[PDB]
Amino acid sequence: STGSATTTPIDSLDDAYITPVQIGTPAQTLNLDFDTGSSDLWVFSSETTASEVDGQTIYTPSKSTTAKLLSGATWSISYGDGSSSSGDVYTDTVSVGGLTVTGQAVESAKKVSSSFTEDSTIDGLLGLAFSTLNTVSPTQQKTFFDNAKASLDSPVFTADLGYHAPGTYNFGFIDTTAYTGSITYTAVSTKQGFWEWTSTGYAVGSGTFKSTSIDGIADTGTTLLYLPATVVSAYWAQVSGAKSSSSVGGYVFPCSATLPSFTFGVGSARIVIPGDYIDFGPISTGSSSCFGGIQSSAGIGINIFGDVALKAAFVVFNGATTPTLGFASK
């Protein structure tokens, strides 16, 4: 089997991407944030504290003939940005782009933090990291990909995120028309439960490539590119007027600037992030200070190849017995 779904930016900055997901019988379609940095599929629901729902579409398990309470199971998660959610668990039929899993754990939110409430466009998350990170207790649950894997034509999914445009998540096959050149594959460590890999270096604009190992995770659920302070300093030093602002919480730059590209290494291959991808607009409405899309990972504890990086590539998440990551230009 295979699946193919379009993923759409939630706003004009590509702050996140939503993908339609069918849950239950008859189908209830919710727009979920596919997140390769976590491993819980959770949704706004009929159980969510009413004051914490503001415009989201909810899952109502009592209206699904295939929903079953997973007795005794609870979940609770906290994300790197400080947001959180928790609740109880159902199993139900879940389909993504024509690909169907029966008995998928659907984690029903009783509580969500303000960040989620305030984002009307995201109805929940669909985790695509390794199932070892899944927070369901006392019986840990498998991700949608893990459940689908054995049925897939090939044990892979791919992320093809658009810049200011829709893209695609495919399950079970590699669309050879979706990228240019060849796909370069690189080793993955699953030790922390992430799609963790090591980039071979970077360049700033038309500058020389610096060979240096950068360990980080491929994370579709994080907006920006978070890299070591040395790397980030080298980038923003090429932008006149750019500075790190503690009050804003990162690098800002004059909105009148033209940003240089940023290149990262995948083995001997190179992925180029155009400068425009690194512009996240005014820090506040009407400001001439703009927020940068490359930020320091210092104090996160991990480097994160988020959407800024991933959307410059066609990315293969290979879930073979020994997982790997593939990157191609597009």
Q: Which of 50, 57, 48 is nearest to 20 (CA)?
A: 57
Q: Judge if 121 and 244 occupy the same domain.
A: no
* Structure determination method: X-ray
Neighbours of 40 (CB within 10 A): 24
| 199 catalytically annotated | yes
Total domains, the chain: 2
Q: Judge if 252 and 270 occupy the same domain.
A: yes
Q: Domain holding 196: CATH number?
A: 2.40.70.10
d(CA 176, CA 191): 30
For 146, the 3-state DSSP assignment is: helix
Q: Judge if 228 and 289 occupy the same domain.
A: yes
One-letter amino acid for residue 167 of the chain: G
Q: Judge if 143 and 249 occupy the same domain.
A: no
Q: Judge if 39 and 141 occupy the same domain.
A: yes
The answer to whether residues 14 and 307 touch, using CB atoms and an 8 Å cutoff, is: yes
Active-site annotation holder among 14, 35, 88, 279: 35
Return the ∠ at Cα 24 (arms to 18 and 27), rounded to 5°.
70
Q: Judge if 123 and 246 occupy the same domain.
A: no
For 86, the 3-state DSSP assignment is: strand
Q: Judge if 162 and 242 occupy the same domain.
A: no
Q: Judge if 151 and 245 occupy the same domain.
A: no
Q: Judge if 117 and 161 occupy the same domain.
A: yes
Burial class (CB in 10 A: 0-12, 13-18, 19+), 304: buried
Q: Judge if 166 and 253 occupy the same domain.
A: no
Active-site annotation holder among 38, 95, 108, 199: 199
Q: Among all chains, which residue has been given the structure tokens 């459940």?
A: 147
Is the peptide bond prior to 274 cis by the omega test (within 30 degrees of 0)?
Answer: no
* Boundary of a domain, candidates 141, 174, 207: 174
* Boundary of a domain, candidates 174, 196, 214: 174
The answer to whether residues 194 and 37 touch, using CB atoms and an 8 Å cutoff, is: yes
Buried b (16+ CB within 10 A) or exposed e, 50-86: eebbeebbbbebeebebbeebeebebebebeeebebb
Q: Judge if 137 and 273 occupy the same domain.
A: no
- The alpha carbon of residue 55 and the mean position of all alpha carbons in its chain are separated, in whole angstroms, by 22
In sequence order, which ranges of 35-92 are alpha helices (DSSP H)?
Answer: none
* Boundary of a domain, candidates 157, 174, 191: 174
Going from the C-alpha of 140 to that of each of 70, 96, 150, the distances in angstroms are: 11, 22, 19
Q: DSSP string covering 170-226, please?
A: EES---TTSSSS-PEEEE-B-TTSS-EEEEEEEEETTSPPEEEEEEEEE-TT--SEE
Q: Judge if 109 and 170 occupy the same domain.
A: yes
Is the peptide bond prior to 254 cis by the omega test (within 30 degrees of 0)?
Answer: no
Please give the resolution of this entry in Å, rounded to 1 decimal: 1.6
d(CA 54, CA 31): 14
d(CA 58, CA 108): 9
| 35 catalytically annotated | yes
Rounded to a whole number, what is the distance in angstroms from the first to the last CA of the chain?
A: 25
The answer to whether residues 156 and 1 touch, using CB atoms and an 8 Å cutoff, is: no
d(CA 32, CA 194): 19
Range of the domain at 127: 5-174
d(CA 169, CA 158): 6
The answer to whether residues 190 and 196 touch, using CB atoms and an 8 Å cutoff, is: yes
